[PDB]
Amino acid sequence: MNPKSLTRGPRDKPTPLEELLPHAIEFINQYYGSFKEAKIEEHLARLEAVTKEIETTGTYQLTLDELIFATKMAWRNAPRCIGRIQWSNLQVFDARNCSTAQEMFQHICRHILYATNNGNIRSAITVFPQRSDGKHDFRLWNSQLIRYAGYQMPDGTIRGDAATLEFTQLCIDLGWKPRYGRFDVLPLVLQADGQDPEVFEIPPDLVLEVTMELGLKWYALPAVANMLLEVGGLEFPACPFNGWYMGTEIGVVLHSFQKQNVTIMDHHTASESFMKHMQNEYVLSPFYYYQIEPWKTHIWQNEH
Ligand code: HEM
Ligand SMILES: COc1ccc(CCNC(=O)C[C@@H]2CN(c3cc(C)nc(-n4ccnc4)n3)CCN2C(=O)C(C)C)cc1
Numbered sequence: 001m002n003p004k005s006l007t008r009g010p011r012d013k014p015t016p017l018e019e020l021l022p023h024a025i026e027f028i029n030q031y032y033g034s035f036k037e038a039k040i041e042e043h044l045a046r047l048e049a050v051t052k053e054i055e056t057t058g059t060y061q062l063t064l065d066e067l068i069f070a071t072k073m074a075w076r077n078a079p080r081c082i083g084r085i086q087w088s089n090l091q092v093f094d095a096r097n098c099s100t101a102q103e104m105f106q107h108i109c110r111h112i113l114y115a116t117n118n119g120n121i122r123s124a125i126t127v128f129p130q131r132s133d134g135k136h137d138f139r140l141w142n143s144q145l146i147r148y149a150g151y152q153m154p155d156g157t158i159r160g161d162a163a164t165l166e167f168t169q170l171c172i173d174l175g176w177k178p179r180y181g182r183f184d185v186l187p188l189v190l191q192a193d194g195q196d197p198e199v200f201e202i203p204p205d206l207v208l209e210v211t212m213e214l215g216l217k218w219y220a221l222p223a224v225a226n227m228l229l230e231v232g233g234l235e236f237p238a239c240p241f242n243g244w245y246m247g248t249e250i251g252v253v254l255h256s257f258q259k260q261n262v263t264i265m266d267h268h269t270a271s272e273s274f275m276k277h278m279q280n281e282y283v284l285s286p287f288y289y290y291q292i293e294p295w296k297t298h299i300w301q302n303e304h
Pocket of ligand 2: 081083144221222223224241242243244245246247249250251
């Protein structure tokens with residue numbers, strides 16, 4: 001067998017033009033091929049523009065329409081995503097002009113607000129600046145936009161999310177005030193332009209939770225924070241996205257989500273979202289890759 005790696009690692013230098021150009025050309029072909037018989041002359045013109053931009057600047061910028069197409073095709077190309085059947089239902093937020101961590105935080109607040117929609121969940125992706133030389137990466141160090149902290153007990157058992165024990169310690173190490181509950185929402189840890197990450201508490205009013213029906217509960221919004229979007233040889237190492245829950249196992253239910261009017265992929269929702277998708281009809285690439293946990297690769301500039 002010849003599987004590919006599902007992981008795309010860091011770089012220390014810009015992608016070589018000899019490697020970048022063929023990938024860009026192939027993506028430009030995929031995009032204009034989505035029109036099939038139209039736009040031959042526009043296709044060729046974009047090819048020339050992209051090629052001269054790469055030759056002059058070492059890289060290129062996607063148009064907004066190309067970016068939107070890319071995020072949706074990468075979604076379509078996600079092997080295990082059940083949601084991908086309605087891939088046209090995706091809202092894109094273009095944050096490619098973002099420069100600071102504070103600005104990242106505001107983009108993410110907007111994303112969480114839009115996607116949560118008081119429970120009527122909408123799928124969205126926010127795209128931060130593409131990798132340049134690999135020394136100025138944007139990254140969310142979180143695995144999810146919303147997730148509970150995990151604390152190790154003296155007996156070896158975990159309080160909270162057992163899967164986040166390491167990340168939770170990192171937050172504490174970064175100065176995050178360690179509460180000790182079973183449902184403490186982790187802070188956003190945000191890296192801008194390759195700098196050391198900064199810690200931002202998520203405004204509590206932005207976190208919608210479903211109370212189970214006892215003591216249990218969970219967050220309504222499943223958002224993956226840590227993957228990298230690849231398209232036309234370009235890499236976007238910060239591109240958080242969300243859908244809604246499957247419900248078959250959230251980790252804490254099907255009644256409680258439905259009761260509090262929080263979207264899950266039940267039969268009604270499956271049918272309606274596919275219906276909405278269908279109405280929009282009026283090496284895989286692009287692709288979402290996993291990355292190496294950034295605290296394992298980051299070179300600390302301040303380390304205080
Ligand atoms: C609208 C609701 C959505 C639902 C119900 C949904 C559901 C799922 C489920 C059940 C998984 C599989 C987990 C596993 O078995 O490993 C998954 C994986 C994934 N989803 Fe979604 N998803 C949705 C939206 C999205 C969106 C909006 C994107 C991105 C634009 C997306 C990208 C992915 C990716 C990249 C994976 C991992 C794929 C892999 O590793 O094979 N999903 N999703
Ligand atoms: C909303 O869809 C679901 C996502 C996660 C779950 C729980 C199962 N958990 C996982 O699969 C763990 C992670 C996180 N994971 C998540 C987690 C969250 C909160 N959300 C998503 N997701 C949202 C939209 N698409 C995917 N995906 C992706 C799959 N994961 C992997 O480790 C694969 C590499 C095997 C149920 C439904």
